[PDB]
PDB file of C-alpha atoms in Angstrom:
ATOM      1  CA  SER A   1     -24.211 -11.082  33.894  1.00 54.56           C
ATOM      2  CA  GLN A   2     -24.395 -14.322  31.950  1.00 51.78           C
ATOM      3  CA  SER A   3     -25.013 -16.271  35.127  1.00 49.44           C
ATOM      4  CA  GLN A   4     -27.780 -13.864  36.072  1.00 49.94           C
ATOM      5  CA  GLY A   5     -29.505 -13.947  32.704  1.00 45.79           C
ATOM      6  CA  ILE A   6     -29.447 -17.721  32.986  1.00 46.20           C
ATOM      7  CA  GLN A   7     -30.857 -17.657  36.525  1.00 48.84           C
ATOM      8  CA  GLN A   8     -33.639 -15.293  35.490  1.00 45.50           C
ATOM      9  CA  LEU A   9     -34.599 -17.643  32.683  1.00 43.76           C
ATOM     10  CA  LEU A  10     -34.459 -20.562  35.093  1.00 42.66           C
ATOM     11  CA  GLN A  11     -36.847 -18.665  37.352  1.00 43.48           C
ATOM     12  CA  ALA A  12     -39.188 -18.199  34.407  1.00 43.17           C
ATOM     13  CA  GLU A  13     -38.985 -21.939  33.722  1.00 43.26           C
ATOM     14  CA  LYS A  14     -39.722 -22.668  37.374  1.00 41.28           C
ATOM     15  CA  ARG A  15     -42.799 -20.487  37.235  1.00 42.44           C
ATOM     16  CA  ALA A  16     -43.921 -22.239  34.065  1.00 42.13           C
ATOM     17  CA  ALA A  17     -43.531 -25.596  35.795  1.00 43.36           C
ATOM     18  CA  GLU A  18     -45.539 -24.316  38.730  1.00 42.13           C
ATOM     19  CA  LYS A  19     -48.259 -22.887  36.527  1.00 47.93           C
ATOM     20  CA  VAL A  20     -48.975 -26.125  34.736  1.00 47.29           C
ATOM     21  CA  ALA A  21     -48.683 -28.301  37.847  1.00 49.25           C
ATOM     22  CA  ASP A  22     -51.153 -25.993  39.607  1.00 47.77           C
ATOM     23  CA  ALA A  23     -53.425 -26.193  36.584  1.00 47.95           C
ATOM     24  CA  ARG A  24     -53.395 -29.996  36.848  1.00 48.98           C
ATOM     25  CA  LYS A  25     -54.232 -29.762  40.556  1.00 48.47           C
ATOM     26  CA  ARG A  26     -57.131 -27.490  39.699  1.00 48.81           C
ATOM     27  CA  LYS A  27     -58.243 -29.956  37.042  1.00 48.40           C
ATOM     28  CA  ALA A  28     -58.437 -32.682  39.671  1.00 48.35           C
ATOM     29  CA  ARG A  29     -60.349 -30.336  41.942  1.00 49.48           C
ATOM     30  CA  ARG A  30     -62.736 -29.263  39.220  1.00 47.58           C
ATOM     31  CA  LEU A  31     -63.461 -32.895  38.357  1.00 46.16           C
ATOM     32  CA  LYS A  32     -64.377 -33.743  41.938  1.00 42.29           C
ATOM     33  CA  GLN A  33     -66.514 -30.622  42.055  1.00 40.43           C
ATOM     34  CA  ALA A  34     -68.157 -31.739  38.820  1.00 36.15           C
ATOM     35  CA  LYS A  35     -69.141 -35.015  40.405  1.00 36.65           C
ATOM     36  CA  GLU A  36     -70.621 -33.396  43.494  1.00 37.11           C
ATOM     37  CA  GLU A  37     -72.472 -30.786  41.485  1.00 33.86           C
ATOM     38  CA  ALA A  38     -73.740 -33.477  39.187  1.00 35.54           C
ATOM     39  CA  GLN A  39     -75.208 -35.332  42.097  1.00 35.76           C
ATOM     40  CA  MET A  40     -76.821 -32.118  43.331  1.00 38.45           C
ATOM     41  CA  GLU A  41     -78.362 -31.668  39.914  1.00 38.40           C
ATOM     42  CA  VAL A  42     -79.520 -35.265  40.020  1.00 39.21           C
ATOM     43  CA  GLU A  43     -81.263 -34.549  43.293  1.00 42.60           C
ATOM     44  CA  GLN A  44     -83.042 -31.561  41.773  1.00 42.35           C
ATOM     45  CA  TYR A  45     -84.043 -33.610  38.750  1.00 39.46           C
ATOM     46  CA  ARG A  46     -85.312 -36.292  41.100  1.00 41.90           C
ATOM     47  CA  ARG A  47     -87.422 -33.850  43.041  1.00 44.61           C
ATOM     48  CA  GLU A  48     -89.010 -32.614  39.845  1.00 43.97           C
ATOM     49  CA  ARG A  49     -89.773 -36.098  38.550  1.00 41.81           C
ATOM     50  CA  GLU A  50     -91.142 -37.112  41.972  1.00 43.02           C
ATOM     51  CA  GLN A  51     -93.505 -34.192  41.741  1.00 43.01           C
ATOM     52  CA  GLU A  52     -94.595 -35.158  38.255  1.00 46.47           C
ATOM     53  CA  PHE A  53     -95.234 -38.705  39.401  1.00 47.33           C
ATOM     54  CA  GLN A  54     -97.378 -37.619  42.342  1.00 49.21           C
ATOM     55  CA  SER A  55     -99.245 -35.181  40.134  1.00 49.66           C
ATOM     56  CA  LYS A  56     -99.953 -37.966  37.674  1.00 46.41           C
ATOM     57  CA  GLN A  57    -101.142 -40.348  40.380  1.00 47.10           C
TER      58      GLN A  57
ATOM     59  CA  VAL B   1     -27.183 -29.633   1.144  1.00 42.96           C
ATOM     60  CA  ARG B   2     -23.515 -29.074   1.887  1.00 47.24           C
ATOM     61  CA  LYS B   3     -24.346 -25.794   3.586  1.00 48.16           C
ATOM     62  CA  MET B   4     -27.316 -27.047   5.519  1.00 48.92           C
ATOM     63  CA  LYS B   5     -25.214 -29.911   6.782  1.00 51.29           C
ATOM     64  CA  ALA B   6     -22.470 -27.528   7.805  1.00 50.03           C
ATOM     65  CA  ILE B   7     -25.057 -25.488   9.620  1.00 46.84           C
ATOM     66  CA  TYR B   8     -26.241 -28.597  11.371  1.00 44.76           C
ATOM     67  CA  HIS B   9     -22.685 -29.439  12.330  1.00 45.89           C
ATOM     68  CA  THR B  10     -22.324 -26.079  13.998  1.00 43.92           C
ATOM     69  CA  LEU B  11     -25.683 -26.454  15.637  1.00 46.44           C
ATOM     70  CA  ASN B  12     -24.327 -29.607  17.158  1.00 47.40           C
ATOM     71  CA  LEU B  13     -21.324 -27.497  18.018  1.00 45.88           C
ATOM     72  CA  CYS B  14     -23.307 -25.895  20.794  1.00 44.64           C
ATOM     73  CA  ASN B  15     -24.487 -25.983  24.400  1.00 43.47           C
ATOM     74  CA  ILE B  16     -28.163 -26.795  24.827  1.00 43.74           C
ATOM     75  CA  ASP B  17     -29.751 -24.896  27.681  1.00 42.86           C
ATOM     76  CA  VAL B  18     -32.326 -26.394  30.001  1.00 44.22           C
ATOM     77  CA  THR B  19     -34.365 -23.403  31.113  1.00 44.10           C
ATOM     78  CA  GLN B  20     -35.069 -22.080  27.633  1.00 43.33           C
ATOM     79  CA  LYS B  21     -35.522 -23.495  24.204  1.00 40.32           C
ATOM     80  CA  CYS B  22     -32.486 -21.415  23.310  1.00 45.68           C
ATOM     81  CA  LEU B  23     -28.887 -22.332  22.689  1.00 45.32           C
ATOM     82  CA  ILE B  24     -26.087 -20.367  24.311  1.00 43.68           C
ATOM     83  CA  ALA B  25     -22.533 -20.728  23.085  1.00 45.66           C
ATOM     84  CA  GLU B  26     -19.067 -19.432  23.782  1.00 46.66           C
ATOM     85  CA  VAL B  27     -18.045 -17.755  20.497  1.00 46.74           C
ATOM     86  CA  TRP B  28     -14.763 -15.893  19.775  1.00 45.67           C
ATOM     87  CA  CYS B  29     -15.060 -13.182  17.065  1.00 47.64           C
ATOM     88  CA  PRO B  30     -12.642 -10.360  16.058  1.00 47.46           C
ATOM     89  CA  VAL B  31     -13.215  -7.042  17.925  1.00 49.64           C
ATOM     90  CA  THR B  32     -12.708  -5.413  14.511  1.00 50.03           C
ATOM     91  CA  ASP B  33     -15.765  -7.242  13.229  1.00 50.85           C
ATOM     92  CA  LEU B  34     -17.873  -6.758  16.358  1.00 50.36           C
ATOM     93  CA  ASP B  35     -20.138  -4.187  14.770  1.00 48.09           C
ATOM     94  CA  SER B  36     -20.350  -6.238  11.632  1.00 49.63           C
ATOM     95  CA  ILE B  37     -21.476  -9.223  13.630  1.00 47.92           C
ATOM     96  CA  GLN B  38     -24.010  -7.319  15.649  1.00 49.07           C
ATOM     97  CA  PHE B  39     -25.583  -6.067  12.444  1.00 43.84           C
ATOM     98  CA  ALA B  40     -25.468  -9.608  11.131  1.00 47.12           C
ATOM     99  CA  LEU B  41     -27.256 -10.852  14.234  1.00 47.84           C
ATOM    100  CA  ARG B  42     -29.904  -8.231  13.684  1.00 42.13           C
ATOM    101  CA  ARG B  43     -30.419  -9.266  10.055  1.00 43.34           C
ATOM    102  CA  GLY B  44     -30.583 -12.952  10.910  1.00 38.82           C
ATOM    103  CA  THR B  45     -33.018 -12.642  13.741  1.00 40.05           C
ATOM    104  CA  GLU B  46     -35.044 -10.018  11.867  1.00 33.38           C
ATOM    105  CA  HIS B  47     -35.851 -12.485   9.142  1.00 31.46           C
ATOM    106  CA  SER B  48     -37.107 -14.869  11.845  1.00 30.45           C
ATOM    107  CA  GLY B  49     -40.588 -14.225  13.268  1.00 34.86           C
ATOM    108  CA  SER B  50     -39.565 -14.468  16.953  1.00 32.87           C
TER     109      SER B  50
END
């Protein structure tokens, strides 16, 4: 059963490797999402400031 | 120091696994002392937090 205990541990290692690689992929995804959301926020900010400007004029 | 070094020697006297931060070794011990060694393993690992 030595070979099997080893294989089971290797499977655990494999999963660990997968879990962090997938986390890094998510990180990349989250960063792109951050940029798009940021721009969307910028657009809302812009609309508000546009309104303030027109109000002031 | 003499003992720690000896311990280190033995630790080098090992096989380092890749999947686990654990060392696995082929060790030959007398059947007569098999219980004695299992109790010793318990005491050793029991001191350790893991």
